[PDB]
Design a protein around this nucleic acid. Structure first.
Lengths: 126, 138, 189, 143, 72, 55
RNA sequence: CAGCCACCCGAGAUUGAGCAAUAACAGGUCUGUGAUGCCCUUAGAUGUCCGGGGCUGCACGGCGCUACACUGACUGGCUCAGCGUGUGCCUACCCUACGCCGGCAGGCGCGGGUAACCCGUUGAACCCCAUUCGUGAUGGGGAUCGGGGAUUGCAAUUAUUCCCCAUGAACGAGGAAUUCCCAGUAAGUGCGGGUCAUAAGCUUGCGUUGAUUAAGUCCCUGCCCUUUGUACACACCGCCCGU
């Protein structure tokens, strides 16, 4: 089969070296909310991450956790936890593959869908 | 040397600086003979050179009309030529020469020197343009 | 005098009809060295009705409003009509223009009947001014019908436009519409 | 000029499609690695004669520009004209070759189908991924 | 059909450029060269190139209804 | 609630940061040239402030 | 006579708007109003807290869009033709030149500007048009998601993300029927201003553009005047007759 490569850039080779020089090469997008600093306004995301990775390891749907955050990404260890929207009306449960690093469409959960379309016939002019 | 006749067509910014020498018109650094449009050349070179090449050697004119548009500096150069010649021969030759050169420059151009106040017109509310409205009523 | 170089002359135009002295203005002082010198005939009290033939050719060709933007193009096509018809015919372009439009064109052109008419037309004795002007209009619209939207190589399309406008080939669409107009004119006869 | 033999009308150079009736900036574009600004920069960096014509072309000339397409990193230019740039299956801008094996050749589209990417779903249809306000929309994708 | 065309300059594009085209009262190579069923635009280009040997600078192309030389 | 939950983010710039300086209305305001009125109040006071209908 | 149509000492021979009467409408606005008549009573009160989200569940017979083509091309051509905004008085939130990160969104830095003084000679078309058009699916899309890397604003999920890349749903102006239009108008294009913490395919203004015009008419849809008829006056969407 084929494993996950970071959009044509090696990933195991990326983890071969140290960790301090990956922020200098951090991917595009999903870092702004915590871009104010690796400081306060961040503990909630890591708390939920520990919650989920303690109730469900990667490659698994998590246990009753509904975070609405984009989950600022560094590695496809994000799987094992779900970004979900909680209102009593929004409930998405999809198992998504761990190929998401800083790039397109790692989120199948959707907060809207087409509403009931009625009959389009019964005349068009008078 | 002051003649005070200028050359001004449309809104082009022009200068007619007079001091004795050859009559040459500089347009984007291109003199009168070799002109910027490169397609209206005969219509401007015909009146002067067929009568004489030393004809413009009377009083040199700095004509640096920073004109954009071919209808702008074209025919502005001939306006300048006719006006400078007529004023020089008016103030500094004699009245009879005035009459004859005015006759030849008027058979050059009967009456089209000066126009009425008009340009592109304003836009009114209720429509996309000056005289136009929104969706039609047939 | 004033002429075209040392090889061409512009004083070879004499028709002597004694009828082009009321609308075609050559009488007193309407002469120009200039083919066109930024006329202001709009602001005048309809003083634009003594217009010559070259300016009719200048102002009666464009399709729709898809040429305006620079009268540079108008004066350039006047100059290049001058030169191209000169190349075609080897003599004065305006003279042969008149020669090749008079021998054809409107003998009794489109004009209505009585107080209102759209069914048929009337074979109307076309006035010399309007016959000449509308023949130049025929040539101009035929030039923008044949030279434009042509399926062949365009450097002889004025020659074939002359052929269609005078000789009468079944190529130009305007000439077959004028053929229907002539069929109505003969229906009058 | 033309010689009394076969003109370069229909031949198989690189399995591409081109017929000798449309002129320059169109014949070179027929190969997906040549054309427009990239052709300009290649013709510059290789110091090529302007007069040369594609009417009776040689295979080597197209191949050399294609090699430059594979490796444009040294030239400091956008490695454009590639649908595979910075995409999975190439450690570094690589060239995949051959036809009739399109599914394998463009497995990128298979990867987009297996991840069911709407972006990937865009390819195969002519439509906007963003999807504008309800109007003349949806008509994008006509077969 | 897929009409056979030649992308560059040709002998037909060079054909009869000074044999009978400039020996007619109407000196216009367009339609006459078109009769060869070979692209007339490049025929005009070849004629202009041979006319501009270097004695007189002729680099302007202008519009379609463009003049040609007189050589009769 | 009074000062504990609110005032923890920049939100001083919305449409509610403005109101007509004559009637405290937040709809149809005029920011141009800084006179800061609604449409109707400005139409009322245009003669006095110095705006005269000539066009 | 009032005037009208063409022109022979001759710059000028209907620019476009503003204002706009008497009498009317049960026209719109009490959601512009410290411009105001007639009112409610009792718990997550329309005012704070709503991660998500309201027309977006939508197929060019409501504004602004495609010319089957020398009238059209990417600077061998520009000494250019050309509305009007812009910073701290409440109030941080303005316009930005120039260098670097750069071959670039975006970020950093000193600088100018209360403005004909700085942005700016505002990048408001490239006229010979130095990739360069023969029977034109193919410069008149490229029926748009991949890529140096993606925001001075919590929320960008139908949306300020951003500098740009081979022919492929149209094919010659695509009619059941429609709160357009006559001298730089229609129609291209773009640039501003109001909205604007973010933002305009909205609106309001501004630019290179014409006439030989149609120097017309009352057949449509309407309006005005006179005469005339009326059983109409709530005025023909009237009145009214009979089964």
């Amino acid at each position: 089969f084929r494993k996950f490569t970071y959009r044509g850039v090696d990933l195991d080779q990326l983890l071969d070296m140290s960790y301090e020089q990956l922020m200098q090469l951090y991917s595009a997008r999903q870092r702004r909310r915590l871009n104010r600093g690796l400081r306060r306004k961040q503990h909630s995301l890591l708390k939920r991450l520990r919650k989920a990775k303690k109730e469900a390891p990667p490659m698994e749907k998590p246990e009753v956790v509904k975070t609405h955050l984009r989950d600022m990404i560094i590695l496809p260890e994000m799987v094992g936890s779900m970004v979900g929207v909680y209102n009593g009306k929004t409930f998405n449960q999809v198992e998504i593959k761990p190929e998401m690093i800083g790039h397109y469409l790692g989120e199948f959960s959707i907060t809207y869908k087409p509403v009931k379309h009625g009959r389009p016939g019964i005349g068009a002019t008078h | 040397q002051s003649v005070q006749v200028f050359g001004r067509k449309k809104t082009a910014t022009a200068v007619a600086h007079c001091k004795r020498g050859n009559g040459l018109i500089k347009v984007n650094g291109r003199p009168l003979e070799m002109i910027e449009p490169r397609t209206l050349q005969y219509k401007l070179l015909e009146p002067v050179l067929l009568l004489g090449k030393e004809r413009f050697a009377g009083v040199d004119i700095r004509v640096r009309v920073k004109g954009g548009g071919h209808v702008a500096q074209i025919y502005a150069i001939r306006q300048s030529i006719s006006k400078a010649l007529v004023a020089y021969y008016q103030k500094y030759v004699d009245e009879a020469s005035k009459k004859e050169i005015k006759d030849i420059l008027i058979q050059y151009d009967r009456t089209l020197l000066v126009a009425d106040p008009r340009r592109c017109e304003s836009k009114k509310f209720g429509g996309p343009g000056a005289r136009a409205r929104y969706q039609k009523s047939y | 005098d004033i002429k075209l170089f040392g090889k061409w002359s512009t004083d070879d135009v004499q028709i002597n009809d004694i009828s082009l002295q009321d609308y075609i203005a050559v009488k007193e002082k309407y002469a120009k060295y200039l083919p066109h010198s930024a006329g202001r005939y709009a602001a005048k009290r309809f003083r634009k009705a003594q217009c010559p033939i070259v300016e009719r050719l200048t102002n009666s060709m464009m399709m729709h409003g898809r040429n305006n933007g620079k009268k540079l193009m108008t004066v350039r096509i006047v100059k290049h009509a001058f030169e191209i018809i000169h190349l075609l015919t080897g003599e004065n372009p305006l003279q042969v223009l008149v020669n090749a439009i008079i021998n054809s064109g409107p003998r009794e052109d489109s004009t209505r009947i009585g107080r209102a008419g759209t069914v048929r037309r009337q074979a109307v004795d076309v006035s010399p001014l309007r016959r000449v002007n509308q023949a130049i209009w025929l040539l101009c619209t035929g030039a923008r019908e044949a030279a434009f939207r042509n399926i062949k190589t365009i450097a002889e399309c004025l020659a074939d436009e002359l052929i269609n406008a005078a000789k009468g080939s079944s190529n130009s669409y305007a000439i077959k519409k004028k053929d229907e107009l002539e069929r109505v004119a003969k229906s009058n006869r | 000029l033309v010689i009394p033999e076969k003109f370069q009308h229909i031949l198989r150079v690189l399995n591409t499609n081109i017929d000798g009736r449309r002129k320059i900036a169109f014949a070179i574009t027929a190969i997906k690695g040549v054309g427009r600004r990239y052709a300009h920069v290649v013709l510059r960096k290789a110091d090529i004669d302007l007069t040369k014509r594609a009417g009776e072309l040689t295979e080597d000339e197209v191949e050399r520009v294609i090699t430059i397409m594979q490796n444009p990193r040294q030239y400091k230019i956008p490695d454009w004209f590639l649908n595979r740039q910075k995409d999975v299956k190439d450690g570094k801008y690589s060239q995949v070759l051959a036809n009739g094996l399109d599914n394998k050749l463009r497995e990128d589209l298979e990867r987009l189908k297996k991840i069911r990417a709407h972006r990937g779903l865009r390819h195969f249809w002519g439509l906007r991924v963003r999807g504008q306000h309800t109007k003349t929309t949806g008509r994008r994708g006509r077969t | 059909d897929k009409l056979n065309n030649l992308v560059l300059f040709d002998k037909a594009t060079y054909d009869k450029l000074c044999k009978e085209v400039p020996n007619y009262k109407l000196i216009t190579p367009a339609v006459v060269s078109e009769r060869l069923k070979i692209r007339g635009s490049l025929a005009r280009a070849a004629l202009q190139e041979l006319l501009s040997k270097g004695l007189i600078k002729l680099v302007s192309k202008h519009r379609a209804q463009v003049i040609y030389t007189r050589n009769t | 609630g009074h000062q504990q939950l609110y005032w923890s983010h920049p939100r001083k710039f919305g449409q509610g940061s403005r109101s007509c300086r004559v009637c405290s209305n937040r709809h149809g305001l005029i920011r141009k040239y800084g006179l800061n009125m609604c449409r109707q109040c400005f139409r009322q006071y245009a003669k006095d402030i110095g705006f005269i209908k000539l066009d």
